[PDB]
């Protein structure tokens, strides 16, 4: 009985496991319950705090993955399996994980809280890419990750009702944040230095905790990688949530109370069966059950909240990857496959655009096409294919990010922006996808530091750099190495200079304006065009 | 006859002419100046199509330039050469239908290719007698026969009550067409080859050349065409019949006036009254818009130039087209607040948004927003130098560069051999401020070979450059090809095609080939903007 692996938290005792990181041991406490299982009558309901427990709770293993749609489009393929649940699905999934240095840190250590992505419809804190051992060992970071409910279970709302108020997945996250405030000192973490980081939907969640007052007292700094609370996919209005919920209810055989009670009688897989059948149009990068503008968790729309908010005492790190949009094209755009080169035609391109910008009117679609055509090579299939990718990435990720960065900087935040440009050598997606959504995570988490994983030596040094930026940022609100010179420095993003860095194998390079002309198009012009039907 | 120069007496269909032996740098040239080609369009003939000049008796003296057509005279900047060089240099008179011929001296033994110049001036001004149109250098140095004509401008040339008998519209175009007919019948008397006639013109002259390409009875009158910084398509070169009716009747009101009664009243008004009210009939505050221009009459112009270029067959057509680097800069000092020839014109964002409304006067609020959106540099959106240069670009692109790209593309796609250029050299003698770059009109002196005159203060490089340009133009007139057939040690000028969209830079350096004529931006003006006016 190793006394390093034995911790008393507020609800009783836990026993972790000593894990090996390539340069030393780490204490890991996996599968800690932070809420009552949200099962039976508790489905769709806010999480309640976990009741105290007798004896020593075994926390040496990852708990269950929250009930979710599983992707089976490319069965056996690593590029997809790596995001698939690696534990039993269950509605009983409200658990978090803590990695700390071994031995338990001497003084209060900065805490990183990871929030996974998965479109608010999938994900799990137990995936190998979210493995907190590397950061814990190399950097002395206390690293936390929680499961939160996804899909209908986490986000189905009948806004206004008491038994399905929506945003419960975000409340799961907030409760895990509360848990950290109350308990992380026991692990040698500093509750007074908590940095959220998250990718994609995880990023939008981090943004939503930024924009929701009760969350603000639970962390001090934030990192949003390839996603934002603003933009076309991260939220829906009360009306559209109600509509999708009633439609799903109809699709499975089902007054709010009665309707919600009926939905609670249904096996989990039944809800998931019809999850993907409530979307208002054929689309990509659009998701059925996502946080809802409820006037409660989100007091107004994200757009409204970032425009008017005060962000004085807040540091934020935001960024995107080089090819935010490639990935998604294969999941519903005619002409795209991971197996060939998807050299598309002009006509496939116009059709791709009605799918990538589902809300676009004919004129809007036209504007998009006309903006993204290379008029010197209007028929060239490589260009059209790359363009389709860019449309999807810009509209859903890069431009919402530029907008967020701009508003936070204007309204007092310290902001650092990046673009991630290194394609992992081990990647199994084709070359034409470049650096797809999500392929920076393994680098930030430190996976190349595991010799068994066959990353190059350059990649292993790259990873060490990123881990340093992220944890420096966690420590100080500033990603720059606070004792180092001639690097050069990563400058803050500002609305005037618009400086950001490229993250790749070469040293930091400062660039200005994040797709500045094209995001002017999405962020300023396109709204005007749509606000005429 | 008896004691005078035997090389200077020529007969044409209307009678006998005496010309003048003129000095060019490289030797003498024959000039026949102020040959009448129409009955003076005066009195009851104002607004009416031209009638051929009734034959005369005796020897007409053709040794001096004739009257300039009645027009507005720019007085914004007195003493200033930048404006003066374009102003009438002969008496203003409604009696102005005269043309000019320059030929080698002595006159060529075999039939020589003919270049016909059609001047610009927005359809409200111009003159074939300006120094920049002096045909002597092309005549002396390239052995060209050069012809230029006065045609009626402003109301006299373009006021229309479409449908009517007494003011049908497009009569200035008809003045031009008559001089083309005069060339067909009479040019061989000067050693010109009526079977090799190239039209060239600039700005409205270019638009004019374009209308002749698009109007059947003009087609048989020339073989090749050069359009410099102007097109018949685009937002300023034509008006709808309805709009010309609107402008003509408003003008009539302003001067105290069925169509017959109205026109008859207009005919009793002194010329100067018409000119004085000319600028008061435009629908909006604007630049690069002119009150009386060619009308889509369903006659001279059977349909809109856009319609006709989109659907026309241009099998047999060789066309050279281009633009200057800074088409827009000139116009900014006329009607855009914040702009001056006397300072750097560093404007504010607000003066930019205002400038765009004036420069794109036909734009809704959404359209103007689109223009502003597209031309803003989002890295430095408040930067006055950028905003100044974007304002120029907006005006240039919208009125000239994109219309030319549109023209070149449609013409190429439909059989034409099209050569394309961007002229990029600023005259060392330019008196406009440096910010204006290479403005509209400042290629002309080069193409006409003025730098060859030692007394003009051009640099040696400019003298050599002018000669190059004259060779391009006259090779093109000779052969339908600007390239020199022997000397292929020089870089070649490829045709412009829809596939490759090639054009060349004309500057002090040897030809450089570039691809895409503002391809992205012109996609905005030509493909997108129209649709934003259908919503």
Coordinates of N, CA, C and O in Angstrom, one line a residue, chain A residues 259-358:
Chain A
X259 N -43.8 14.2 -22.1 CA -42.9 13.9 -23.2 C -41.5 13.5 -22.6 O -41.0 12.4 -23.0
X260 N -41.0 14.2 -21.7 CA -39.7 13.9 -21.0 C -39.8 12.6 -20.3 O -38.8 11.8 -20.4
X261 N -40.9 12.3 -19.6 CA -41.0 11.1 -18.9 C -41.1 9.9 -19.8 O -40.5 8.9 -19.6
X262 N -41.7 10.1 -21.0 CA -41.7 9.1 -22.0 C -40.3 8.8 -22.5 O -39.9 7.6 -22.7
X263 N -39.5 9.9 -22.8 CA -38.2 9.7 -23.3 C -37.3 9.0 -22.3 O -36.4 8.2 -22.7
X264 N -37.6 9.2 -21.0 CA -36.8 8.5 -20.0 C -37.0 7.0 -19.9 O -36.2 6.3 -19.2
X265 N -38.0 6.5 -20.6 CA -38.3 5.0 -20.5 C -37.6 4.3 -21.7 O -37.7 3.1 -21.7
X266 N -36.9 5.1 -22.5 CA -36.4 4.5 -23.7 C -34.9 4.0 -23.5 O -34.1 4.8 -23.0
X267 N -34.6 2.7 -23.8 CA -33.2 2.4 -23.9 C -32.3 3.5 -24.5 O -32.8 4.1 -25.5
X268 N -31.1 3.7 -24.0 CA -30.2 4.6 -24.5 C -30.0 4.5 -26.0 O -30.1 5.5 -26.7
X269 N -29.8 3.3 -26.6 CA -29.5 3.1 -28.0 C -30.6 3.6 -28.9 O -30.3 3.9 -30.1
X270 N -31.8 3.6 -28.4 CA -33.0 4.1 -29.1 C -32.9 5.6 -29.5 O -33.1 6.0 -30.6
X271 N -32.6 6.4 -28.5 CA -32.3 7.8 -28.6 C -31.2 8.0 -29.7 O -31.3 8.8 -30.6
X272 N -30.1 7.3 -29.5 CA -28.9 7.4 -30.4 C -29.3 7.0 -31.8 O -28.8 7.6 -32.8
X273 N -30.2 6.0 -32.0 CA -30.7 5.6 -33.3 C -31.2 6.7 -34.2 O -31.1 6.6 -35.4
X274 N -31.8 7.7 -33.5 CA -32.5 8.8 -34.2 C -31.9 10.2 -34.0 O -32.5 11.2 -34.5
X275 N -30.8 10.2 -33.4 CA -30.0 11.4 -33.1 C -29.7 12.2 -34.4 O -29.9 13.4 -34.4
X276 N -29.3 11.4 -35.4 CA -28.9 12.0 -36.6 C -30.0 12.3 -37.7 O -29.7 12.5 -38.8
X277 N -31.2 12.3 -37.2 CA -32.4 12.4 -38.1 C -33.2 13.6 -37.7 O -34.3 13.8 -38.2
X278 N -32.7 14.5 -36.9 CA -33.4 15.8 -36.6 C -32.8 17.0 -37.2 O -33.3 18.1 -36.9
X279 N -31.7 16.9 -37.9 CA -31.1 18.1 -38.5 C -31.9 18.7 -39.6 O -32.5 18.0 -40.5
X280 N -32.1 20.1 -39.6 CA -33.0 20.8 -40.5 C -32.6 20.7 -42.0 O -33.5 20.9 -42.8
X281 N -31.4 20.4 -42.3 CA -31.0 20.2 -43.7 C -29.8 19.2 -43.7 O -29.1 19.0 -42.7
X282 N -29.6 18.6 -44.9 CA -28.3 17.9 -45.2 C -27.2 18.9 -45.0 O -27.2 20.0 -45.5
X283 N -26.2 18.5 -44.1 CA -25.1 19.4 -43.7 C -23.9 18.6 -43.3 O -24.0 17.4 -43.1
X284 N -22.8 19.3 -43.1 CA -21.7 18.8 -42.4 C -21.3 19.8 -41.3 O -21.8 20.9 -41.4
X285 N -20.5 19.4 -40.3 CA -20.2 20.3 -39.2 C -21.4 20.9 -38.5 O -21.4 22.0 -38.1
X286 N -22.4 20.1 -38.4 CA -23.7 20.5 -37.8 C -24.2 19.3 -37.0 O -24.1 18.2 -37.4
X287 N -24.7 19.6 -35.8 CA -24.9 18.6 -34.8 C -26.2 18.8 -34.1 O -26.6 19.9 -33.8
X288 N -26.9 17.6 -33.8 CA -28.3 17.7 -33.4 C -28.5 18.3 -32.0 O -29.5 19.0 -31.8
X289 N -27.7 17.9 -31.1 CA -27.9 18.3 -29.7 C -26.6 18.9 -29.1 O -25.6 18.2 -28.9
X290 N -26.7 20.2 -29.0 CA -25.5 21.1 -28.6 C -26.0 22.1 -27.6 O -27.2 22.1 -27.4
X291 N -25.1 22.8 -26.9 CA -25.6 23.7 -25.9 C -26.7 24.6 -26.5 O -26.7 25.0 -27.7
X292 N -27.6 25.0 -25.6 CA -28.8 25.8 -26.0 C -28.7 27.2 -25.4 O -28.4 27.3 -24.2
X293 N -29.0 28.2 -26.1 CA -29.1 29.6 -25.6 C -30.4 29.6 -24.8 O -31.5 29.7 -25.3
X294 N -30.3 29.6 -23.5 CA -31.4 29.2 -22.6 C -31.8 30.4 -21.7 O -32.8 30.3 -20.9
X295 N -31.0 31.4 -21.7 CA -31.2 32.6 -20.9 C -30.8 32.3 -19.5 O -30.9 33.1 -18.6
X296 N -30.2 31.2 -19.3 CA -29.7 30.7 -17.9 C -28.2 30.5 -17.9 O -27.5 31.3 -17.4
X297 N -27.8 29.3 -18.4 CA -26.4 29.0 -18.5 C -25.8 30.1 -19.4 O -24.8 30.7 -19.0
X298 N -26.4 30.2 -20.6 CA -26.0 31.2 -21.5 C -27.1 32.3 -21.5 O -28.2 32.1 -22.0
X299 N -26.8 33.4 -20.8 CA -27.8 34.5 -20.6 C -28.2 35.2 -21.9 O -29.3 35.8 -22.0
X300 N -27.4 35.1 -23.0 CA -27.7 35.6 -24.3 C -27.0 34.7 -25.3 O -26.3 33.7 -24.8
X301 N -27.0 34.9 -26.6 CA -26.2 34.2 -27.5 C -24.7 34.4 -27.3 O -24.3 35.5 -26.7
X302 N -23.9 33.4 -27.6 CA -22.4 33.7 -27.5 C -22.0 35.0 -28.2 O -21.4 35.9 -27.6
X303 N -22.5 35.2 -29.5 CA -22.2 36.5 -30.2 C -22.4 37.7 -29.3 O -21.6 38.5 -29.1
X304 N -23.7 37.8 -28.8 CA -24.0 38.9 -27.9 C -23.1 39.0 -26.7 O -22.8 40.1 -26.3
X305 N -22.8 37.8 -26.1 CA -22.0 37.8 -24.9 C -20.5 38.2 -25.1 O -19.9 38.8 -24.2
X306 N -20.0 37.9 -26.2 CA -18.6 38.2 -26.5 C -18.5 39.7 -26.9 O -17.5 40.3 -26.6
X307 N -19.5 40.2 -27.6 CA -19.6 41.6 -28.0 C -19.6 42.6 -26.8 O -19.0 43.6 -26.8
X308 N -20.3 42.2 -25.7 CA -20.6 43.1 -24.6 C -19.8 42.7 -23.4 O -19.8 43.5 -22.4
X309 N -19.1 41.6 -23.4 CA -18.5 41.1 -22.1 C -17.3 41.9 -21.7 O -16.6 42.6 -22.5
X310 N -17.0 41.8 -20.4 CA -15.7 42.3 -19.9 C -14.7 41.2 -19.5 O -15.0 40.3 -18.7
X311 N -13.5 41.3 -20.2 CA -12.6 40.2 -20.1 C -11.2 40.7 -19.6 O -10.2 40.1 -19.9
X312 N -11.3 41.7 -18.7 CA -10.1 42.4 -18.2 C -9.1 41.4 -17.5 O -7.9 41.4 -17.9
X313 N -9.6 40.6 -16.6 CA -8.6 39.7 -15.8 C -8.6 38.3 -16.3 O -8.8 37.4 -15.6
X314 N -8.4 38.2 -17.6 CA -8.5 36.9 -18.3 C -7.4 36.7 -19.3 O -7.3 37.6 -20.2
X315 N -6.6 35.7 -19.3 CA -5.7 35.2 -20.3 C -6.3 34.1 -21.1 O -6.9 33.1 -20.6
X316 N -6.2 34.1 -22.5 CA -6.7 33.1 -23.3 C -5.7 32.8 -24.4 O -5.0 33.7 -24.9
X317 N -5.6 31.5 -24.7 CA -4.8 31.0 -25.9 C -5.7 30.3 -26.9 O -6.5 29.4 -26.5
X318 N -5.7 30.7 -28.1 CA -6.6 30.2 -29.1 C -5.9 29.9 -30.3 O -4.8 30.5 -30.6
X319 N -6.3 28.9 -31.1 CA -5.7 28.6 -32.3 C -6.4 27.6 -33.1 O -7.4 27.1 -32.7
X320 N -5.9 27.3 -34.3 CA -6.5 26.4 -35.3 C -5.4 25.6 -35.9 O -4.2 25.8 -35.6
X321 N -5.7 24.6 -36.7 CA -4.8 23.7 -37.4 C -4.9 24.2 -38.8 O -5.8 24.9 -39.2
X322 N -3.9 23.8 -39.7 CA -3.8 24.2 -41.0 C -5.0 23.8 -41.9 O -5.3 24.4 -42.9
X323 N -5.7 22.7 -41.5 CA -6.7 22.2 -42.4 C -8.0 21.8 -41.7 O -8.5 20.7 -41.8
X324 N -8.5 22.7 -40.9 CA -9.7 22.5 -40.1 C -10.8 21.8 -40.8 O -11.6 21.0 -40.2
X325 N -10.9 22.0 -42.1 CA -12.1 21.5 -42.8 C -12.0 20.2 -43.6 O -13.0 19.7 -44.1
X326 N -10.8 19.6 -43.7 CA -10.6 18.5 -44.7 C -11.4 17.3 -44.2 O -12.3 16.9 -44.9
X327 N -11.1 16.8 -43.0 CA -11.8 15.7 -42.3 C -13.2 15.5 -42.7 O -13.6 14.4 -43.0
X328 N -14.0 16.6 -42.7 CA -15.4 16.5 -42.6 C -16.0 16.2 -44.0 O -17.2 15.8 -44.1
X329 N -15.2 16.5 -45.0 CA -15.7 16.4 -46.4 C -16.1 15.0 -46.7 O -17.1 14.8 -47.4
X330 N -15.3 14.0 -46.3 CA -15.6 12.6 -46.5 C -16.8 12.1 -45.8 O -17.4 11.0 -46.2
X331 N -17.4 12.8 -44.9 CA -18.5 12.4 -44.1 C -19.8 13.0 -44.7 O -20.8 13.3 -43.9
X332 N -19.9 13.1 -46.0 CA -21.1 13.6 -46.6 C -21.0 14.6 -47.8 O -22.0 15.2 -48.2
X333 N -19.8 14.8 -48.3 CA -19.7 15.6 -49.5 C -19.4 14.7 -50.7 O -18.3 14.2 -50.8
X334 N -20.3 14.6 -51.6 CA -20.1 13.8 -52.8 C -18.8 14.2 -53.5 O -18.5 15.4 -53.7
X335 N -17.9 13.2 -53.8 CA -16.7 13.4 -54.5 C -15.5 13.3 -53.6 O -14.4 13.3 -54.0
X336 N -15.8 13.2 -52.3 CA -14.7 13.1 -51.3 C -14.6 11.7 -50.7 O -15.5 11.1 -50.2
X337 N -13.3 11.2 -50.7 CA -13.0 9.9 -50.1 C -11.6 10.0 -49.5 O -10.8 10.8 -50.0
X338 N -11.4 9.3 -48.4 CA -10.0 9.2 -47.8 C -9.1 8.3 -48.7 O -7.9 8.2 -48.5
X339 N -9.8 7.5 -49.6 CA -9.1 6.4 -50.3 C -8.5 6.8 -51.7 O -7.4 6.3 -52.0
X340 N -9.1 7.8 -52.3 CA -8.4 8.4 -53.5 C -7.9 9.9 -53.2 O -7.5 10.1 -52.0
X341 N -7.9 10.8 -54.1 CA -7.4 12.2 -53.9 C -8.5 13.2 -54.0 O -8.3 14.4 -53.9
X342 N -9.7 12.8 -54.2 CA -10.9 13.6 -54.2 C -10.8 14.9 -55.1 O -11.3 15.9 -54.8
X343 N -10.1 14.7 -56.2 CA -10.0 15.8 -57.2 C -11.4 16.0 -57.7 O -11.9 15.2 -58.6
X344 N -12.2 17.0 -57.2 CA -13.6 17.3 -57.6 C -13.7 18.2 -58.8 O -12.8 18.9 -59.2
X345 N -15.0 18.2 -59.3 CA -15.4 19.1 -60.4 C -15.9 20.4 -59.8 O -16.2 20.5 -58.6
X346 N -16.1 21.4 -60.7 CA -16.8 22.6 -60.4 C -18.2 22.4 -59.8 O -18.6 23.1 -58.9
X347 N -18.9 21.5 -60.4 CA -20.3 21.3 -60.0 C -20.5 20.7 -58.6 O -21.4 21.0 -57.9
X348 N -19.6 19.8 -58.3 CA -19.5 19.1 -57.0 C -19.2 20.2 -56.0 O -19.7 20.1 -54.8
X349 N -18.4 21.1 -56.3 CA -18.0 22.3 -55.5 C -19.2 23.1 -55.1 O -19.3 23.4 -54.0
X350 N -20.0 23.5 -56.1 CA -21.2 24.3 -55.8 C -22.1 23.6 -54.8 O -22.8 24.2 -54.0
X351 N -22.2 22.2 -55.0 CA -23.1 21.4 -54.3 C -22.5 21.2 -52.9 O -23.3 21.2 -51.9
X352 N -21.2 21.0 -52.8 CA -20.4 20.9 -51.5 C -20.7 22.1 -50.6 O -20.9 21.9 -49.4
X353 N -20.8 23.3 -51.2 CA -21.0 24.5 -50.5 C -22.4 24.6 -49.9 O -22.6 25.2 -48.8
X354 N -23.4 24.0 -50.5 CA -24.8 24.1 -50.0 C -24.8 23.1 -48.8 O -25.6 23.3 -47.9
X355 N -23.9 22.1 -48.8 CA -23.8 21.2 -47.7 C -22.9 21.8 -46.5 O -23.3 21.7 -45.3
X356 N -21.8 22.4 -46.9 CA -20.9 23.1 -45.9 C -21.4 24.3 -45.3 O -21.1 24.7 -44.1
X357 N -22.2 25.1 -46.0 CA -22.9 26.2 -45.5 C -24.4 26.0 -45.6 O -25.0 26.6 -46.5
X358 N -24.9 25.0 -44.8 CA -26.3 24.6 -45.0 C -27.4 25.7 -44.8 O -28.4 25.7 -45.4

